[PDB]
Design a protein around this ligand. Structure first.
Ligand SMILES: Cc1ncsc1-c1ccc(CNC(=O)[C@@H]2C[C@@H](O)CN2C(=O)[C@@H](NC(=O)COCCOCCOCCNC(=O)C[C@@H]2N=C(c3ccc(Cl)cc3)c3c(sc(C)c3C)-n3c(C)nnc32)C(C)(C)C)cc1
Lengths: 111, 149, 104, 87
């Protein structure tokens, strides 16, 4: 039950990484590079960063006890983006599109 | 204008690396061809940079506006990455003429209102006053790109 | 690596490059070519130190860091007339004028 | 290599490779073995010759290039020489 849900969580992240969704998924592939983006205040505001590669490592390392912990990390990744940026920023639009894919597959997971 | 960034919104990871003795000012040409200054790099320093495909950059001395080179040439345009490998931008001094080099040093020691009080040939006054300039170069670069076409 | 030199005597100054691994004798061959004087009629100096034909420039103390194209290192030269070597003597260059008021 | 003799106003003889001296447009025109500059003094002309060595060494070099240094008190005269010599 728990292990079968954790394979589904993996299947979902794999889809989030796929070419199909590359046009809006690409900013969340890796951790936020505050140097390159020139964001002096990002760590002051975002106390707990998250990204897709970090989540992938945690799955493969069996660190998530269940599907809810996997979800809270995906939702953390998005919440960080909405928190830091203004409503009508290109990255917030991109985040929304990807979250719709996440929420749909996460809701259709058998429990 | 002709020389301007493309509004691609496609990512490009870049490394700016200053291997000159000058403090470097990176200059970004925007979608309307207007130069936008970015934070400066001290000599010997480098850093990761997030830019986009088809964006134009050039590089200058932050105090004097003397032109510098990037990967042996005047302009820099990033490609898309290959297997997440960074694109490298190596910034260096060009080999100036002795004349231009003497102009730089005299400019650094004399206030512009005193240029014409120096005991030298009249034509060098004009030469001294015609400072290194981004706009002036953009026209030369534009019109060499037209001749090319 | 390479070293860049001013070889100097009286009011004569030769500009040339060479290597750290090259020898004093090899440097005299360059001089022979230019000024028509064989090695046995030449004496080469670093400051006041007479240099031996068999030693390399690196061993005499010339390094690429202190002998650059834009700031070459100096080597003194003395000839022999009538079976006795003359005293080393390098005529100095002229002096720059005083700095103008507006450049102070 | 062929050499040429550059002689300053104060009677100093500077001997450099022909190829290095051809960096100057004014000299290039004169030659095409010995050349006298009756108005440029040794403390200036010596500096010019160093510039030739620098230019020939670092043109088409893919090594990073160092600054050519010019002391404040020779800058005015070296500027006049450079302009007169076209280099
Ligand atoms: C320190 C330094 N020293 C010498 S240079 C330098 C320096 C170099 C680069 C930067 C930052 N990069 C730029 O400013 C680049 C360089 C040049 O290519 C132009 N440029 C732009 O960003 C331009 N932008 C574009 O062409 C794309 O335009 C969308 C406008 O938004 C850009 C970012 O907004 C301003 C600051 N905000 C952020 O960076 C937030 C950030 N955005 C994004 C982001 C930004 C744009 C898009 Cl389209 C998608 C996601 C982001 C991520 S992660 C990630 C990989 C990215 C790319 N992200 C997440 C997650 N959450 N927030 C973010 C410009 C001038 C219009 C702002 C800062 C300093």
């Amino acid at each position: 039950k728990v292990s079968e849900q954790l394979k589904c969580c993996s299947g979902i992240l794999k889809e989030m990484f796929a070419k199909k969704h590359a046009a809006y998924a690409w900013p969340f592939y890796k951790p936020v590079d505050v140097e390159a983006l020139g964001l002096h205040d990002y760590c002051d505001i975002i106390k707990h960063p998250m990204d897709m590669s970090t989540i992938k490592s945690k799955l493969e390392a069996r660190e998530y006890r269940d599907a809810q912990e996997f979800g809270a990390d995906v939702r953390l990744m998005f919440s960080n983006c909405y928190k830091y940026n203004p409503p009508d920023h290109e990255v917030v639009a991109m985040a929304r599109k990807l979250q719709d894919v996440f929420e749909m597959r996460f809701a259709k997971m058998p429990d | 204008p002709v020389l301007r960034s493309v509004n691609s919104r496609e990512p490009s990871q870049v490394i700016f690396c200053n291997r000159s003795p000058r403090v470097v000012l990176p200059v970004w040409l925007n979608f309307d061809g207007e130069p936008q200054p970015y934070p400066t790099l001290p000599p010997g320093t480098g850093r990761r940079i997030h830019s986009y495909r088809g964006h134009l950059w050039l590089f200058r001395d932050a105090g004097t506006h003397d032109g510098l080179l990037v990967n042996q040439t005047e302009l820099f345009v990033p490609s898309l990455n290959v297997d997440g490998q960074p694109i490298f931008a190596n910034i260096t001094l060009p080999v100036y003429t002795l004349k231009e080099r003497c102009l730089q040093v005299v400019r650094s020691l004399v206030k512009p209102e005193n240029y014409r009080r120096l005991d030298i040939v009249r034509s060098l006054y004009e030469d001294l006053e015609d400072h290194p300039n981004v706009q002036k170069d953009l026209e030369r670069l534009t019109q060499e790109r037209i001749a090319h076409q | 690596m390479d070293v860049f030199l001013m070889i100097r005597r009286h009011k004569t100054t030769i500009f040339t490059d060479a290597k750290e691994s090259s020898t004093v004798f090899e440097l005299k061959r360059i001089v022979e070519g230019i000024l028509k004087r064989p090695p046995d009629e030449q004496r080469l100096y670093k400051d006041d130190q007479l240099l031996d034909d068999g030693k390399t420039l690196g061993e005499c103390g010339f390094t690429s860091q202190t002998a650059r194209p834009q700031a070459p290192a100096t080597v003194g030269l003395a000839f022999r007339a009538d079976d006795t070597f003359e005293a080393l003597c390098i005529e100095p260059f002229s002096s720059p004028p005083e700095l103008p008021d507006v450049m102070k | 290599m062929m050499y040429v003799k550059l002689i300053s106003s104060d009677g100093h003889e500077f001997i450099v490779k022909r190829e290095h001296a051809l960096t100057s447009g004014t000299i290039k025109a004169m030659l095409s073995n010995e050349v006298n500059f009756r108005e440029i003094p040794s403390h200036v002309l010596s500096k010019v010759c160093m510039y030739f060595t620098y230019k020939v060494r670092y043109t088409n070099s893919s090594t990073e290039i160092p600054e050519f240094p010019i002391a404040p008190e020779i800058a005015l005269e070296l500027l006049m020489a450079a302009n007169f010599l076209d280099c």
